[PDB]
């Protein structure tokens, strides 16, 4: 004849979460940028024998 409870009282849990992030960066661009591919010498010949 005994009956159960409508529900059981559970235990409560507290959650504490921490997220930490640090970012650092450097960027350098120094100097002189010369050309590396340049035209060279040329030579041509032409003649009419007849």
């Amino acid at each position: 004849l005994a009956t159960p409870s409508p529900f059981d009282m559970e235990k409560m849990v507290w959650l504490d979460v921490n997220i930490l992030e640090i970012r650092k960066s450097v960027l350098e661009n120094f100097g002189v940028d010369w050309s590396k591919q340049i035209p060279g010498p040329f030579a041509a010949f032409g003649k009419d024998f007849v």
């Binding site: 529900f7 009282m9 559970e10 409560m12 120094f30």
Partner: protein, 50 residues
């Protein structure tokens, strides 16, 4: 095309808990500091004070 679709800023909490009659319970909380710094400078003159 002309059908503007909006974005949202949302704060949502979906919790399962149990407490006594008339008690106040916190189900969500947040502290969130953020900082960012970017610097561009000339090589040597940028470090002179003031």
């Amino acid at each position: 095309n002309g059908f503007t679709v909006p974005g949202f800023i949302t704060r949502r909490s979906n919790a399962e808990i149990n407490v006594g009659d008339g008690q106040t319970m916190v189900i969500s909380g947040l502290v969130n500091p953020k900082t960012a710094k970017n610097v561009s400078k000339l090589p040597w003159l940028g470090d002179i004070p003031i």
